[PDB]
């Protein structure tokens, strides 16, 4: 319906301008004589930029070796996190940790940070010990005992950092940090370490007679 | 009204400049003699870029096979999630899970991650068991019993990961994870598994005599 | 005032450079002799890009048929949601559900997902049943009764999905999902179905003697 | 101080390269002989793009008529909301509802959704009735009475939608919607309608003996 | 160290390709004979775009008069809010309301909304009266008394809007709006008006015997 | 491995097309005869744009003087906040208030707002006095006493604004503002003023017998 | 399947237009005779921009020295934070503090702020002392004692700032700041200082007999 409107308006204006009035002079204006092939050729290479970008980065990642097949990857700027299964010239395929596929233009990789935890040395452990303002006295001996517990712990890479320190206050909690690594990289082993650690911690706290700290409040009634 | 203003100002300036004063010299400045067809031709191919991009990516997805018809898709960077019903040269049509249609320029796909859970191997299960700080003693035996329960569970792909581990503390809760897959991909079967699982879990907890953990607080009165 | 500054500085520098000193040589530098028409012509087609984009997409949506007049539309990437009332070559007009007008450049549509619920097959129903941790025992029989209730329900498209399953825990609630469609698309009919459904649900729960679940907490006093 | 550094380094390198050593050959490299006028002319039309865009869209909105003077406008993608007071070729002026002025490049409008509630037909009313889980029994009769109240209400456009339906559960509340329009567009009249409506509603609820619902919780003590 | 690597690899490949093997043919490839001045000249005008944009918009704001010196400005899209102290060709200087300076490229202004409250007519007043669900009966007489109080108030521009209406429910509160302007623009006068207003309001409420509404909740114990 | 695939596919197609079939005609297509130096030269000046932008803005900030060495700077659009230590042609170096270094492309500055609190006149003070709804009566005398306290305060620039006014209600609090400047700019002096001020305020409140306001709530039990 | 559609439609239209009708005239339109090599050559240098950008910035960071190997880095605009292990011409490699690798295009660095805490002078300490409104009297003597404690503290760089001042009120807390540096940069030493500090603080508070402040509320019952 609307192209009828466009064509009818153009046909109306032209036929009226050339029947009511009629052109004494002659204009040489050809809608189709314009040889300017050049325009579409020009337009070819511009139009296809994502694909062109993909082949370049595919080549480079075929030479540059950020990651390899079967390596756990993550990105900190995009939700791109799994294991490589394949490369392509333009895009790769990842199995997510949902055992699901992920198809990805590689041109993305050119301007984005990239991480390979499957290349890493070790895994990390951190926690925060919510302790009560009541328990302020015993903090140093708790921490020190705690540091010793980790230092006598086998699964740790003692040559990596080991930090046990009351770093900050908080709302109704006195938060001691933890920062320890494992000389393993096996997820399950790391978690077993984490578990036994937390348990030994709790043993230590409750052995010192102090207690952890929920959120807390102070009320005035009426 | 305003084109009257523009045209009147131009006509005023010109007619005044050419009647009050009048040009002794002669300037050859033609508003219409400029042959530069070239400009509009140039402008053609630039103006139509989204459409041009759509045809290219349509061709490529006709060759490249990220997804196929009738496959559940999702994206992690856009709310694009349903089942394909059709392809076009430029855009496709998805039925959402609202049984609603979705029309989409394919040029988008060129620079965006893509997922095909309908191609996947399996489905996933995870949970977090909110346990009370009181219940710290029984955690290992609970977990181990729990691990055994899953390992004796039929619907699981035991060859896929099976992680039951106290991964973190929290506000008033001791959170044990769960990470288990199903050798099925049928949504309803997966959910039935999930249901029976949760029930067996609860049985296990309350059989151990411990209890789950709501949010909790500690109050000081006046 | 400030053009006085610009012109005065230029006039000062020039008149001083040509009166204190005066140019022995002769430079042929003409501020106006530059024939380069080419620049403004070039600038014409570039300057007007939004309008140019609008006409193209207007043509395509006149050929491509994402939506039609009088169809409820929504977008998931922009707050664009109403019923079409009109097309234009460049922009359309929507009545929002406020019975208000909305004027829109069509060039937008080229690079944006689009939805036509007024083309859909059916409408959807979902809910989440907040149940108490106390009520863990009766969950399966509740669900099953509930599934039967829907299956014996007339207004449902039983050939579409029907999922009743305890999908997740939560803070102080055991959340059973619901996922059911209606073979209607009439908003009001859909809502009447929804209403009667919720009522039958509540009847079922309270007939089983269990109860729903508010948010809950656990307090320790002093 | 720093241009002394730049010029001194260049002068040092050159004078040393041409006094310690001295050029046997002769290079014809002129810092100023480059006739390439072309560069600045090129740069003219590119540099001024926002202004160029403003004039185009000013013309089009002088032809295209999204809005008119004295019309309440809003945008859903930008905080642009008031009444037009003026047009310009490039920008317009809005009085906000703070009785404050707003000056705006019109080029913005080319690629942005636009709304004219001052062109609308009617105004809207919606609410959500927080009812208690206790009150589940009386919901249908409440709703139906409520629907009748609106239907017997004069200021309503009964030919527009009238939806009164229990659409969703919530945290400690059973939320019934409302969706009704007014055949007026006068803000104050609309509000008077809204007020009397809410009052009649409350009368209806408390006449049925049920009650509304605050947020609520369930506590376990120690 | 690394340029040694680059240069050494290039020198190694070349010297090996021209000593182990040696070129029978002769290639005329000159790293420096390329006359293409054109490239750097081209690059000049492109490189300096922000500065070029600043001069243009500086000229226009020297002609276009969005704001003037000493005028309070704000933007709704950027945290740009103070009083002008100066103009420049490219950038201006604002004193913030911290009595601090702010230096700003003017090119920004070309594509951004702009506001001049220092040009305004009047200032605004709004509030929301949190009333209890208990107090539903007295709402109309309260509002009406309240409307009268404002109407008999001197500092108001009664010819501007005056809206006192129960616009919405809320969590544990019945929220009546306020919308009134002052025929002044002096900040301090406006605030004195606001203060005395709020006081008269409170007098009115507590004179009617009703009361305001905090957040509230409803508890079920165990 | 994959370049073997690319090269092998090309070699396979070509050798098969030229051995199974063989070209009767002769095509003059040279992969290397293309003289188009022009492409890489073109590409030079485009590729290096960030660096080019940095030198320009470095020159301008060497002429334009937004900031100087040793001046506290901040930006409202980026977390760029410290003291200048150095300029470069392309980038500068800031010491943050962590006594840490910050290296920055200057091209950024071209299109970003900029602030120099180290150039300012004075520092600012503001607060909000949470008062209880009970205390509504005494507000004016409190404020007035408070205004007098500041007016008799030495360290204030009384010629700058001094606003003490009940500006808004809130959840369980009646919030009076404060807006006062110091004729100093020394951080520590400003803070000492702030401290003594707050103390005098508290003295004033508790001398009037009223009290501040925490968050508050209203409970209904069962 | 779909290329069959495209090719079949084109073949159908052409063969029908040239068999049903047949071209009396002769058009010289060659799909392959277009010599315009120029297009792909043009497209080469444009397509590869990320890589080109990487080499430039690699060179510059090889000359410009923001950071060096083994230096802790962070960015305030991206989650880019670890220790350098390597440089490349285009990208570098960071070990995160997870002992994980990070591969990064250097072109990013050109337009982004950068920080080198491993180059810093010192580390920082800050805290906020939540004190009760009850404790308003003792604030100055507490602060002053506290200032003295730090001033007599060895590990501090007393020549750097030392600020102890009641800077703000808050919800149920009177918040005194802390701002002190350490003449060390060793993480663990800094934390040991922090720990002993916090302890001395607590000693000071509880020695003054006042107490810290949790969140607090004020309740009205029914």
Lay out the secondary structure:
The structure is a homoheptamer of 222-residue chains.
Chain A: H1 2-17, H2 38-47, H3 49-63, E1 72-74, E2 81-86, E3 91-96, E4 101-105, E5 114-115, E6 123-131, H4 139-151, E7 162-163, E8 166-170, E9 173-182, H5 187-208, E10 216-220
Antiparallel strand pairs in A: 1-2, 2-3, 3-4, 6-9, 7-9, 8-9
Helix pairs in contact in A: 4-5
What does this structure look like?
Seven copies of one chain form a homoheptamer. Chain A has 222 residues and is α+β, with helices and mostly antiparallel strands. Chain A folds into two domains: 49-118, Roll (SH3 type barrels); 123-208, 2-Layer Sandwich (Alpha-Beta Plaits). Helices cover 34% and strands 24% of the residues of chain A. Chain A has five helices and ten strands. In chain A, β1 (72-74) and β2 form a beta hairpin. The radius of gyration of chain A is 34 Å and the shape is elongated. In chain A, 27% of the residues are buried. The interface between A and F is small, with 4 and 4 residues. Chains A, B, C, D, E, F, G: This is Low conductance mechanosensitive channel YnaI. Chains A, B, C, D, E, F, G: GO terms for molecular function: identical protein binding; mechanosensitive monoatomic ion channel activity. Chains A, B, C, D, E, F, G: It is found in: Cell inner membrane. Chains A, B, C, D, E, F, G: Keywords: Cell inner membrane, Cell membrane, Ion channel, Ion transport, Membrane, Transmembrane, Transmembrane helix, Transport. Chains A, B, C, D, E, F, G: Its main location: membrane.
